[PDB]
Design a protein around this ligand. Structure first.
Ligand SMILES: Nc1ncnc2c1ncn2[C@@H]1O[C@H](COP(=O)(O)OP(=O)(O)OP(O)(O)=S)[C@@H](O)[C@H]1O
Ligand SMILES: Nc1ncnc2c1ncn2[C@@H]1O[C@H](COP(=O)(O)OP(=O)(O)OP(O)(O)=S)[C@@H](O)[C@H]1O
Ligand SMILES: Nc1ncnc2c1ncn2[C@@H]1O[C@H](COP(=O)(O)OP(=O)(O)OP(O)(O)=S)[C@@H](O)[C@H]1O
Ligand SMILES: [Mg+2]
Ligand SMILES: [Mg+2]
Ligand SMILES: [Mg+2]
Lengths: 315, 340, 293, 162, 170
């Protein structure tokens, strides 16, 4: 069959990863040099952490990749016994590698690892660092215990810029010979919200549905991120405007009340314009409405009353 | 083929498996040293309070072959030792997971084993994947063949000379039943063949006893409760006591129950006894209990004497224990209590 | 009897053996019972990836009556745990039980099992459940596209399975190759904590009765071509208990990645069908080639 | 048989042509199956809009009348803990098709009721076995889905019925 | 390949990065612990990650153990002086004939013998799996038994615990 473009066009070399130019350049330097230290790679979903670690391991180990890499993720058994036996035996293995090259243990989604396993990892890292190096990949670097962080170089991946997403989208379009327009690519990038995976999925969906990637065609399938709609609803200077946004853009589109209130809390946490007193009062009202929704009264009237209270506070 | 060895007899396979199992109980990883005359499997615990060593002579194996000069990969395991007579001996040492080797060496409940082969190939014509792997080939009586290749890590070998020093001290101190003279001659020959050389400080005590009585007494000993063993020898009897001291908590509450079980053997029963002129020695029991079960696994009728020899000098000094079989030497060294 | 199906036997060994063979598929799940004039079959499936069917023919029963006319067969579903517990409690005095009778009166009635002793009879009724939409016939060997076939002695295969289980085997690879001069190579290669290990079956007409590679069409024999099947040991090991009583085992692998094991112990016959993994990793392929060459 | 059923079940759409109101989604999914390029899918919407009906109809169209043999359906009524993801879903997604009938389909209905640990374990199962298997996740509450899972799925919104 | 924190690790007690007063207190306590009849049997060091607990303990042991070890009466395992000043517990060790929960129990039962001519400092940094309730209870029992033991002679026992928060896990 035909693979989805998200997996079909997964970068296979470090030079095809867009964004985080400084970090990717440093990874390329490490690959060409060899002296890879223990590292932690943190960042939001779909920005290239897994791809970056895999590409770096491949470039470092060459043909020895099969015998020199041990990959484990949240879908595998990773308990304390695994650390005691499998990882320990891999780190004990004597493998002849070119100078400056070490075995690599990739621990994808390391944040989910249990406390006992993480504590056990300390001793193996202490003992087998001369021949083995650890690459953790996670979304929250703080979920790795401090004794493990103390041994690793930290690398934080930032959200991808519109320029990098556009460049990769153009490369994919050229490879696939896809017909498009500037407004269509703008809409895809705007709906991706910095997630390259979502951008590729939306591009593929639009192409399959209609082929030509225009703004109207993109917005027929893809929806604008509802956090922005919630921000617009909260920032409306008129009660009727907020109510109209809540009705037309969220309620009648099938968005659940619980999702609306959770997104409202998340957005209100990041409103830079408002004062602290107003912000905390809005948070209180959102929390009370959330309590009411959890009890079973998830009605449009409750959300309208929440908006009315927020507007009252703004005055 | 850097090294190759084969075992065919059933009792030989039994003793090999038992030795590997005991060594695995002592430490997670066993150390194998191949020489031009013997294979040494040894183990030492984390606290360095116990050392176990089993040496299989080349005559033990049906086929034996060692070509150290062919080793290319894993060269860090190759060692050269200079003899006192001006000779160079080549050795190859490596470390292997004890549990894995024990599982490989165990006899299937239903199917028997015809031959058991262990080999190492680190020569030039060796694939990269197969480098640093111990090849094990097991032929079954049903013509089934099983193959294993557990990984190993080359290491350096540091011989232990406690046995040689104890033997020399015992010979100097106590060196008439003809058996005693035979023991003296055997010890002198062993010391001479080794690759290396009336104050109270020269205290030495030797006990040769039939291991059957000790094994019978220890069969009732549960190491989980009786963790200490005390040997008390005088000119009339030898007492072996498996014991455990009590522990009292804050308000004298019993945190750990004391226990003791003793067995006495007349000195007449003991094969030999030499004392430095009621000697007492205390050490750990688990390792001794496990070690006493290796020799009997073969059960050789010819020259069959499951006699254990013990040497001890002073509290806090090591206690040495020796057992022998037609082509196997078993050694156990333990640290003794320093009290008094 | 007035029941639509009624079969009585004096050999309690067949029933307990069938339950023992079905146990590895889960102590708490469903079992399908098919009833027809030919006999009575127990069927179990796991994870839409493995299936077992154990047949009990008419001859095994001293009495067998199938009076249904509208339908040539009857299908029902029961819970394995219920039968297991009931038999375990009832079979405590195995020396005294003299007769065992199974009965069924069609859809809407329970599956009745009666243990008849000299003076005491114990009757149990198991409630039945709707049969899942999944079709047992879905997982079957394509008889027209056999990649290879082999006949093996039960004892040797059972010993090999025991060895694989005792080393904590995680992945299994069935390797089958044929050459001239009646040279055959059937082997099981295991990936486990020990690494890669091999168990080779001798090329003798005592344990490996015959081996043939058909080039994926069941007809043309090809020499020098190796057929490799990659399986998860979790599913492969489920045939160990069936092999324990097996007298002969017939392996048949097709091109669609289906392996069928027919176990023969008048007698109890078993058929286990399993799917293989999608593909073999490069490291595993290299290690298998090195082991076999 | 169907006559005794409640109308909510007696009138369940059998083919995609019987699903009304979701014209855009039906159009897109039909073209995807026509080209055979189905990606991982998320169906998000309020109760009774046609999500389960649509996914079942799509499975029927892809695999004809024998879809029950190569589709693994799980819902809130089934335990779907991390152990289930590690064993059952993993083994189904990592095994060949019954008759080499393209890719396999795993339907996770009401996936908003799954635990965070199970969803986290699902990420690499979805990613690694994409060649052979495709996932469909149905939900009414998106806030219960982890960001990683949402990133991996092509999202389709079922609107309230016009 | 070498990591700098290993390449440039301290070679002597003076190069250790530690406040002078804390080092003085630790040294006095440890030196007192080595005396024939020491009041304190266990020294418990606690602190955040990478604050030189184990490093300072090892550097201090390198000086204290040779000064207080009785000269062997011509007895030793190997020809070398057996430079094993520090004996550390290994939490990932698995042996054939021992349940996991008892591993630590075995270790201490050997560690008690390392006195006088076999003197060595016992260091516990890699703890057993204390997240398991039964294992933690057994560990506490063993620590209490060591504290309340009636053995006239015991070696100094140092427990280094690195304190850190456990991130919330699903
Ligand atoms: N910087 C990037 N450049 C090119 N493609 C990218 C990039 N980031 C993501 N992608 C694409 O999206 C797919 C997934 O990328 P990943 O490396 O798995 O993202 P991720 O950050 O690891 O997501 P998580 O943390 O596992 S949810 C890749 O196969 C690429 O096709
Ligand atoms: N688009 C639709 N077209 C025709 N009938 C529908 C449609 N949607 C729902 N129904 C009818 O309502 C019944 C339920 O449809 P479902 O597909 O199960 O709705 P749903 O969106 O899956 O509900 P939830 O999210 O699980 S509460 C169907 O049997 C149909 O009879
Ligand atoms: N001047 C130095 N002082 C202390 N440590 C140094 C120094 N230079 C390099 N290092 C290294 O930094 C590390 C010090 O960390 P530790 O001694 O392990 O602290 P800790 O209190 O034991 O924290 P944990 O429990 O090991 S995470 C050692 O590996 C030292 O080898
Ligand atoms: Mg990732
Ligand atoms: Mg539904
Ligand atoms: Mg430290």
């Amino acid at each position: 069959l035909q693979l989805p473009w998200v997996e079909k066009y997964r970068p296979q070399v470090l030079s095809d990863i867009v964004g985080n130019k400084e970090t990717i350049d440093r990874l390329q330097q490490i690959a060409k040099d060899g002296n890879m230290p223990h590292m932690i790679i943190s960042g939001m979903p779909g920005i290239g952490k897994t791809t970056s670690v895999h590409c770096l391991a491949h470039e470092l180990l060459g043909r020895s990749y099969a015998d020199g890499v041990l990959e484990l993720n949240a879908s595998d058994d990773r308990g304390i016994d695994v650390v005691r036996n499998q990882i320990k035996h891999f780190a004990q293995k004597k493998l002849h590698l070119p100078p400056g090259k070490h075995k690599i243990v990739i621990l994808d989604e390391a944040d989910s690892m249990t406390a006992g396993a993480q504590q056990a990892l300390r001793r193996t890292m202490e003992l087998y660092s001369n021949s083995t190096r650890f690459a953790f990949a996670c979304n929250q670097s703080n979920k790795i215990i401090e004794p493990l962080q103390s041994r690793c170089a930290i690398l934080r991946y930032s959200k991808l810029s519109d320029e990098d997403v556009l460049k990769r989208l153009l490369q994919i379009i050229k490879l696939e010979d896809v017909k498009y327009t500037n407004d269509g690519l703008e809409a895809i990038i705007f709906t991706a919200e910095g997630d390259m995976r979502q951008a590729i999925n939306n591009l593929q969906s639009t192409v399959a549905g209609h082929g030509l990637v225009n703004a109207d065609n993109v917005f027929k399938i893809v929806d604008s991120p509802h956090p922005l709609i919630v921000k617009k609803m909260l920032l409306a200077s008129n009660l009727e405007d907020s109510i109209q946004i809540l009705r037309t853009d969220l309620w009648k589109k099938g968005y659940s009340s619980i999702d609306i209130v959770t997104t409202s809390f998340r957005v209100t946490k990041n409103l830079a314009q408002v004062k602290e007193s107003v912000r905390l009062e809005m948070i209180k009202e959102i929390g009370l409405t959330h309590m009411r929704i959890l009890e079973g009264v998830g009605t449009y009237l409750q959300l309208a009353s929440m908006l009315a209270k927020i507007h009252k506070l703004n005055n | 083929m850097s090294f190759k060895a084969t075992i065919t007899e059933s009792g030989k396979q039994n003793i090999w498996f038992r030795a590997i199992y005991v060594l695995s109980t002592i430490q997670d990883d066993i150390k194998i040293t191949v020489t031009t005359n013997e294979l040494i499997a040894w183990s030492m615990n984390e606290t360095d309070t116990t050392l176990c060593q089993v040496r299989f002579q080349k005559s033990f194996f049906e086929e034996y072959e060692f070509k150290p000069h062919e080793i290319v990969f894993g060269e860090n395991g190759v060692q050269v030792i200079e003899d006192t007579y001006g000779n160079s001996h080549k050795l190859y040492s490596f470390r292997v997971n004890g549990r894995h080797l024990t599982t490989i060496s165990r006899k299937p409940d239903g199917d028997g084993i015809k031959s058991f082969t262990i080999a190492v190939n680190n020569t030039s014509t060796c694939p990269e994947s197969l480098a640093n792997r111990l090849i094990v080939v097991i032929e079954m009586d049903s013509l089934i063949v099983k193959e294993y290749c557990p990984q190993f890590q080359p290491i350096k070998y540091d011989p232990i000379i406690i046995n040689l020093k104890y033997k020399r001290r015992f010979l100097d101190v106590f060196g008439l039943d003809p058996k005693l003279l035979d023991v003296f001659t055997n010890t002198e020959r062993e010391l001479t063949s080794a690759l290396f050389n009336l104050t109270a400080a020269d205290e030495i005590n030797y006990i040769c006893c039939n291991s059957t009585l000790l094994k019978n007494f220890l069969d009732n000993c549960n190491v989980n409760v009786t963790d200490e063993v005390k040997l008390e020898i005088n000119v009339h009897r030898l007492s072996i006591t498996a014991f455990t001291k009590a522990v009292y908590g804050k308000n004298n509450d019993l945190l750990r129950n004391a226990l003791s079980m003793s067995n006495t053997i007349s000195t007449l029963d003991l094969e030999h006894y030499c004392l430095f002129t009621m000697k007492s020695i205390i050490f750990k029991l688990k390792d001794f209990k496990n070690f006493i079960t290796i020799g009997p696994s073969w059960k050789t009728t010819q020259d069959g004497n499951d006699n254990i020899s013990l040497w001890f000098c002073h509290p806090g000094d090591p206690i040495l224990m020796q057992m022998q079989k037609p082509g196997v030497k078993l050694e156990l060294v333990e640290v003794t209590d320093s009290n008094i | 009897l007035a029941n639509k199906f009624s079969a009585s036997t004096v050999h309690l060994e067949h029933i307990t053996t069938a339950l023992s063979c079905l146990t590895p598929f889960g102590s708490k799940d469903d079992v399908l019972i098919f009833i027809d004039a030919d006999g009575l079959s127990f069927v179990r499936e796991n994870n839409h990836v493995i299936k077992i069917q154990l047949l009990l023919s008419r001859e095994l029963f001293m009495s067998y009556s199938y009076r249904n006319e509208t339908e040539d067969h009857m299908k029902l579903c029961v819970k394995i745990n219920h039968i297991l517990d009931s038999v375990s409690v009832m079979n405590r005095n195995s020396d005294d039980i003299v007769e065992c009778t199974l009965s069924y009166d069609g859809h809407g009635s329970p599956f009745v099992l009666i243990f008849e002793d000299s003076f005491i009879s114990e009757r149990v009724e198991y409630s039945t459940y709707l049969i899942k939409d999944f079709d047992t016939n879905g997982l079957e060997l394509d008889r027209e596209r056999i990649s290879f076939e082999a006949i093996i002695k039960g004892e040797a295969l059972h010993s090999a399975l025991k060895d694989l289980k005792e080393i904590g085997c995680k992945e299994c690879y069935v390797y089958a190759k044929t050459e001239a001069n009646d040279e055959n190579v059937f082997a099981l290669i295991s990936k486990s904590q020990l690494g890669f290990s091999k168990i080779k079956l001798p090329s003798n007409r005592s344990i490996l009765e015959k081996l043939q590679v058909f080039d994926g069409d069941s007809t043309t024999v090809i020499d020098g071509f190796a057929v490799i099947g990659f399986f998860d040991f979790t599913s492969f090991d489920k045939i160990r208990k069936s092999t324990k009583i097996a007298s002969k085992v017939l392996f048949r692998m097709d091109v669609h990645g289906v392996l069928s094991v027919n176990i023969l112990s008048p007698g109890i016959v078993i058929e286990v069908c399993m799917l293989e993994k999608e593909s073999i990793d490069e490291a595993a392929q290299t290690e298998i080639e090195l082991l076999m060459e | 048989s169907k006559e005794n059923l409640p109308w909510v079940e007696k009138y369940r759409p059998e083919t995609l042509d019987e699903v009304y109101g979701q014209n855009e989604v039906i159009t897109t999914v039909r073209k995807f199956v026509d080209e055979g390029k189905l990606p991982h899918l998320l169906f998000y919407g309020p109760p009774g809009t046609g999500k389960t009906s649509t996914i079942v109809a799509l499975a029927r169209e892809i695999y004809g009348k024998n879809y029950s043999n190569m589709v693994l359906e799980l819902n809130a009524s089934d335990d779907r803990g991390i152990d289930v993801v590690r064993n059952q879903i993993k083994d189904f997604a990592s095994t060949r098709q019954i008759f080499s009938k393209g890719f396999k389909l795993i339907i996770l209905d009401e996936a908003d009721a799954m635990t965070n640990a199970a969803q986290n374990a699902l990420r690499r199962v979805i990613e690694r076995y994409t060649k052979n298997t495709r996932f469909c996740v149905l939900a009414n509450y998106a806030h219960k889905l982890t960001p990683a899972l949402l990133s991996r799925c092509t999202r389709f919104r079922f609107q309230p019925l016009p | 390949g070498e990591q700098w924190y290993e390449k440039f690790k301290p070679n002597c007690l003076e190069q250790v990065a530690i406040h002078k007063r804390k080092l003085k207190d630790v040294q006095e306590a440890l030196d007192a612990m080595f005396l024939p009849n020491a009041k304190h049997r266990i020294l418990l060091l606690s602190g955040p990650s990478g604050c030189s607990k184990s490093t300072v303990i090892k550097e201090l042991s390198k000086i204290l153990v040779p000064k207080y070890r009785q000269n062997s009466n011509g007895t030793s395992f190997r020809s070398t002086p057996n430079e094993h000043k520090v004996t550390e517990f290994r939490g990932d060790c698995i042996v054939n004939d021992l349940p996991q929960m008892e591993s630590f129990s075995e270790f201490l039962k050997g560690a008690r013998y390392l006195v006088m001519s076999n003197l060595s400092l016992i260091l516990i940094e890699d703890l057993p799996n204390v997240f398991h309730i039964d294992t933690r209870r057994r560990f506490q029992q063993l620590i209490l038994q060591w504290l309340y033991s009636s053995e006239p002679l015991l070696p100094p026992l140092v427990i280094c615990i690195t304190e850190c928060e456990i991130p919330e896990n699903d």
